[PDB]
Amino acid sequence: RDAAMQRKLEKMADQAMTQMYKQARSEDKRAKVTSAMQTMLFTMLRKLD
Amino acid sequence: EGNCDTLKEILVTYNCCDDDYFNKKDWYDFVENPDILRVYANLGERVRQALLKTVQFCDAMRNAGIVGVLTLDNQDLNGNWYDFGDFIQTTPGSGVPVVDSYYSLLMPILTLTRALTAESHVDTDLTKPYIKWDLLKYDFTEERLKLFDRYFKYWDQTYHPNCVNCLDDRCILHCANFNVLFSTVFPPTSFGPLVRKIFVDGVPFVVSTGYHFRELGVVHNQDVNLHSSRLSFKELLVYAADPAMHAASGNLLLDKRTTCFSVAALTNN
Ligand SMILES: [Zn+2]
């Protein structure tokens, strides 16, 4: 038990870590692109009024 | 094209083209020899006259109080009529005709010969300038209704200049059809998105709030909000994927390479 169960605890904890890493990088990209498009909008109008 | 004799006879009988035109091979094709459109067009006025005369005849029968049906084969090319073989008589001012088969058959021609362009001239004369429409006007409703009334007077079905007011779908068809024909008259710089100035966080934007479809009439967006504080994601998106702010921030373009109506350019090269 304890020398097989404890072997699965590590596996599951580490896959949880890697998936939270991927989710973090994902939501990072989101912030980046939304900042970029906001900048594009705000600079577009600044040529017409 | 194996035997379109009667067509050739009709075409020469009205000076749309002279028999010489019938050796330029592929004269009948469209994508080959697009010129055929022009010689087709030289029929329009005769068709339009036929229409006006049949309107007069309809109202005449209505006042007279007669009932009957209208088949094309009982109509000359000048516009007159004849063969009152089976009409029956009723009280005057109560008569009724049947113009369902007539128009339903005629409808494809009217865009083939463009027989309705004679309504874009300053006063329905071929020998006059175009009406100088106001660059800003985009509604055009009672105009379509007026046209309908001047021609399709007895097309016994309600027409809705804006399909938004249609019932089922079949009403959408029966309205967008007429819209197709009518939209050939108005300025082509008056379709597309319908933009509007808004404010957000005390800042002016230009965004579309509607559309003028040359087949669907006017349509207004239903949930526009003047004056907001910030912008979430979906609204960022829908204001990014629109041409309004893009186009209005562009430099005017006019290209002669294409007959397609250009609009704008985003760069200097
Ligand atoms: Zn309708």
Task: Take residue B144 and report the two structure tokens written for it.
Answer: 């379509």
Q: Compare all CA atoms of chain B with the CA of A41 and give the residue at the minimum distance.
A: B240
Report the distance separating Cα B16 and Cα B172, nearest Å: 36
Q: What tokens were used for B23?
A: 């050796």
Minimal Cα–Cα distance from A33 to chain B, Å? 11
Nearest to B152 by CA among B144, B142, B164, B141: B144
B182 neighbors B147 (Cβ within 8 angstroms): yes
A33 touches chain B (CB under 8 A): no
Annotated binding residues of B for Zn(2+): 160, 166, 171, 175
CA–CA gap between residue A13 and residue A4 (Å, rounded): 15
Asked whether B62 and B96 are in contact (CB, 8 A), the reply is yes
Task: Considering only the beta carbons, identify the residue of A37, A38, A44 that sits closest to B249.
Answer: A44
Per DSSP, B156 falls in state -
The alpha carbons of chain A give a radius of gyration, in whole angstroms, of 22
Structure tokens of B128?
A: 């006059």
Q: What is the enclosing helix (H) or strand (E) of B197?
A: strand B192-199
Q: Is B144 helix (H, G, I), strand (E, B) or coil?
A: helix
Q: Across the interface, do A45 and B246 touch by the CB < 8 Å criterion?
A: no
Structure tokens given for B9: 């006879």
Q: DSSP string covering A1-49, please?
A: -TTTHHHHHHHHHHHHHHHHHHHHHHHHHHHHHHHHHHHHHHHHHTTT-
Count the Cβ atoms, other than its own, within 10 Å of residue B257.
6
Residue B129 DSSP symbol: P
Rounded Cα gap, residues B166 and B173, in angstroms: 9
Helix, coil or strand: residue B22: helix
Contact in structure between B163 and B217 (CB atoms under 8 Å) = yes
Helices (H), B26-127: 36-41, 44-64, 100-112
Q: Distance between CA B74 and CA B97 in Å, rounded?
A: 14
Q: A9-44 burial string, b = 16+ CB within 10 Å, else e?
A: eeeeeeeeeeeeeeeeeeeeeeeeeeeeeeeebeeb
Q: Report the alpha-carbon distance of residue A48 to residue B249 in Å, rounded.
A: 6
What whole-number distance in Å separates Cα of residue B265 and Cα of residue B269?
9
Radius of gyration over every alpha carbon of chain B, rounded to an integer in angstroms: 24
Residues 6+ apart with CB under 8 A from A23: none
| Residues that constitute the known binding site of B | 74, 83, 160, 166, 171, 175
> Using an 8 Å Cβ cutoff, are B45 and B15 in contact?
no
Give the bridge partners for B198, in sequence order: B205
Instruction: State which approach was used to obtain the coordinates.
Output: cryo-EM
Residue with tokens 């001047």: B150
Instruction: Using a CB–CB cutoff of 8 Å, tell me whether A44 touches chain B.
Output: yes
Q: What is the residue type of A29?
A: K
Determine contact, residues B35/B108, Cβ cutoff 8 Å: no
Residues in chain B whose Cβ is within 8 Å of chain A: 203-206, 231, 233, 236, 239-240, 245-246, 248-249
Quick one: DSSP state of residue B131?
Answer: P
d(CA B53, CA B56): 5
Question: How many C-beta atoms surround the C-beta of residue B249 within 10 A?
Answer: 17
